[PDB]
Swiss-Prot record:
Subunit structure: Interacts with mRNA-capping enzyme nsP1. Interacts with host DDX1. Interacts with host DDX3. Interacts (via C-terminus) with host FXR1; this interaction inhibits the formation of host stress granules on viral mRNAs and the nsp3-FXR1 complexes bind viral RNAs and probably orchestrate the assembly of viral replication complexes. Interacts (via C-terminus) with host FXR2; this interaction inhibits the formation of host stress granules on viral mRNAs and the nsp3-FXR2 complexes bind viral RNAs and probably orchestrate the assembly of viral replication complexes.
Lineage: Viruses, Riboviria, Orthornavirae, Kitrinoviricota, Alsuviricetes
Residues represented out of the complete protein: 1330 to 1489 of 2493
Domain notes: In the N-terminus, the macro domain displays a mono-ADP-ribosylhydrolase activity. The central part has a zinc-binding function. The C-terminus contains two approximate repeats necessary and sufficient for formation of the nsP3/FXR complex.
Macro domain: residues covered: 3-162
Natural source organism: Venezuelan equine encephalitis virus (strain P676)
Function: Seems to be essential for minus-strand RNAs and subgenomic 26S mRNAs synthesis. Displays mono-ADP-ribosylhydrolase activity. ADP-ribosylation is a post-translational modification that controls various processes of the host cell and the virus probably needs to revert it for optimal viral replication. Binds proteins of FXR family and sequesters them into the viral RNA replication complexes thereby inhibiting the formation of host stress granules on viral mRNAs.
Entry membrane topology: Peripheral membrane protein
Name of the featured protein: Non-structural protein 3
């Protein structure tokens, strides 16, 4: 059995100390803010600049960072049923890369819970797809968030498991 471990981190994912970082990208590969996003400013070298399909992911092995760019659904644009399918897909595409490269630890935010949320709280929905996919890996998973209320909810959800 593959067995992940999970813990929650409130802060900036650029500062993460895991083996690889996940960029929750748009289909242009950009983080939030475009070129103004912290990850881009810090590691432009780990950003190739090519299109990524929705629900797909692409690893870039930057010297200063290894970054998995993964495209969740934009709920402003896609139906609830289609977006759920794509969200599960996006996390699955991340887990696959984690396995094929045998990453030991990974830093991951909650896909589609910001600009792609459609102004709804998707914490639980996004977390649940994250756990299902990362349960197929052996990685130690740092789950990243910005908001202090979200942090407490993430810890609860994480402790309820098993």
């Amino acid at each position: 059995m593959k067995a992940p471990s999970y813990h929650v981190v409130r802060g900036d994912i650029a500062t993460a100390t895991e083996g690889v970082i996940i960029n929750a990208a748009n289909s242009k590969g950009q983080p939030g803010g475009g070129v103004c996003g912290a990850l881009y400013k810090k590691f432009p070298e780990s950003f190739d600049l090519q299109p990524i399909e929705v629900g797909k992911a692409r690893l870039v092995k930057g010297a200063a960072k290894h970054i998995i760019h993964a495209v969740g659904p934009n709920f402003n644009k896609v139906s609830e049923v289609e977006g759920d399918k794509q969200l599960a897909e996006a996390y699955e595409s991340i887990a696959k890369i984690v396995n094929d490269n045998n990453y030991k630890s990974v830093a991951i935010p909650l896909l589609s819970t910001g600009i792609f949320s459609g102004n709804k709280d998707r914490l639980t929905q996004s977390l649940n797809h994250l756990l299902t996919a990362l349960d197929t890996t052996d990685a130690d998973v740092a789950i990243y968030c910005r908001d202090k209320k979200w942090e407490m909810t993430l810890k609860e959800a994480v402790a309820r498991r098993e």
